[PDB]
């Protein structure tokens, strides 16, 4: 009986740190994803499990849109199989990944001068995170032989790091708002629909 | 450490009014959807209220919409319940909780000591 | 709305049994359940969310199943610290429900 608020994701006006990764429920609605593709304004559109072409005429069931700001080099990252800082140890996509990711330049409104310090990731972790966790612990990470006892210093490491997104930064170097669309095959009542979509 | 801390229960007479706090630590809490969950002496949970990051979005259990209020205040990493027009039946233990990811998937992965709430004459 | 009901109330077992608790939902809930643990003055803990993913730092043999309506909690091999009040959750749509727990006590 809606119109999926895409506008409320793509278009919102504060995204999160990839670490804190946002999840926002999309169901009983209809997407019309060829809006998003046809009026292609993205850097990365590339879909797991479905072709971009088929989605309009597709029904799903536990439709997610995760969404978040990293790197250019790291978008890399948000893809089955993959490895590094992200993909370990703050945003993991399943191997079965059945889902859209989607990602844009956001140079023009998460750099500013002097440097955007407010976004966040994750570079150490015990053990790298199962499909979709999400981690949102600020305790000392320790490197090395001795217990840090919530004091930084030598291998006693604040787990988590500053982007520092200035304009001028290298395209690898940029800020990158990513959403990520995961969708689960029809096997059940169909909770989104494209426009063209059979039950 | 993740924690959550609860305060401002006690007695509070039928018909009266208390406003309830959690205090964050340990996580940035603008990024995190919380939400409050009651239990009374001897019975089971039950989810009283939740409101999302920027408390643009509040949610409310059908026995307390209209006399329960939930906010929340980021920059003193706070969440409040202000019950009004109280009754014996709200009379419990309430736990202050965090959800794992947001409002629309996830469980409540983190949850406080919970403060009594007494309402009697 | 939706109602959950949660059986049994309670059950008696012994070390090393395996414990199922079930829990029936009046609506289709896809897997949007979750299964929480308390113990006498202790807050809840979460076991298992989205019917059947472990929660980090919890013991493998806590095991969620189920989908849609009915949906089971699976303690296999019963451990000493396994005796407690176990509650199922549905977590969507709003508003929110818990079942009514199953006290899983310990025979003799």
């Known amino acids: 009986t809606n119109l999926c608020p895409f506008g409320e994701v793509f278009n919102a006006t504060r995204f999160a740190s990839v670490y804190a990764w946002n999840r926002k429920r999309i169901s009983n609605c209809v997407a019309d994803y060829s809006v998003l593709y046809n009026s292609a304004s993205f850097s990365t559109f590339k879909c797991y499990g479905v072709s971009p072409t088929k989605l309009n005429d597709l029904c799903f069931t536990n439709v997610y849109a995760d969404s978040f700001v990293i790197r250019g080099d790291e978008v890399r990252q948000i893809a089955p199989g993959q490895t590094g800082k992200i993909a370990d140890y703050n945003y993991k996509l399943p191997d079965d990944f059945t889902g859209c990711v989607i990602a844009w330049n956001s140079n023009n409104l998460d750099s500013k001068v002097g440097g955007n310090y407010n976004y966040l990731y994750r570079l150490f972790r015990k053990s790298n995170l199962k499909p979709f966790e999400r981690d949102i612990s600020t305790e000392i990470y320790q490197a090395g032989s001795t217990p840090c006892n919530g004091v930084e210093g030598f291998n006693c490491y604040f787990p988590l790091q500053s982007y520092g997104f200035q304009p001028t930064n290298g395209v690898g170097y940029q800020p990158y708002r990513v959403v990520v669309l995961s969708f689960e095959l029809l096997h059940a009542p169909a909770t989104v629909c494209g426009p063209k979509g059979s039950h | 450490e993740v924690q959550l801390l609860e305060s401002g229960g006690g007695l509070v007479q039928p018909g009266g009014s208390l406003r309830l706090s959690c205090a964050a630590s340990?996580?940035?809490?603008?990024?995190?959807?919380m939400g409050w969950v009651r239990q009374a002496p001897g019975k089971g949970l039950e989810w009283v209220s939740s409101?999302?990051?920027?408390?643009?979005?509040?949610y409310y259990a059908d026995s307390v919409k209209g006399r329960f209020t939930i906010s929340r205040d980021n920059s003193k990493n706070t969440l409040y319940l202000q019950m009004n027009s109280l009754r014996a039946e709200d009379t419990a233990v309430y736990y202050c909780?965090?959800?794992?990811?947001?409002?629309?998937?996830?469980?409540?992965?983190?949850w406080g000591q919970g403060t009594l709430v007494t309402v009697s004459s | 709305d939706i109602q959950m009901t949660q059986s049994p109330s309670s059950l008696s077992a012994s070390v090393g049994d395996r414990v199922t608790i079930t829990c029936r939902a009046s609506?289709?809930?896809?897997?949007?359940l979750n299964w929480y643990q308390q113990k006498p003055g202790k807050a809840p803990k979460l076991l298992i969310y989205?019917?059947?993913s472990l929660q980090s730092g919890v013991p493998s043999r806590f095991s969620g199943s189920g989908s849609g309506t009915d949906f089971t909690l699976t303690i296999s091999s019963l451990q000493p610290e396994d005796f407690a009040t176990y509650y199922c959750?549905?977590?969507?749509?709003?508003?929110?429900?818990f079942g009514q727990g199953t006290k899983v006590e310990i025979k003799r």
């Open positions: 959750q549905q977590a969507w749509p709003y508003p929110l429900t």
């Open positions: 609506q289709y809930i896809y897997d949007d």
């Open positions: 909780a965090k959800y794992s990811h947001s409002v629309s998937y996830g469980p409540f992965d983190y």
């Open positions: 989205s019917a059947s």
């Open positions: 409101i999302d990051s920027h408390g643009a979005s509040t």
């Open positions: 340990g996580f940035r809490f603008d990024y995190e959807d």
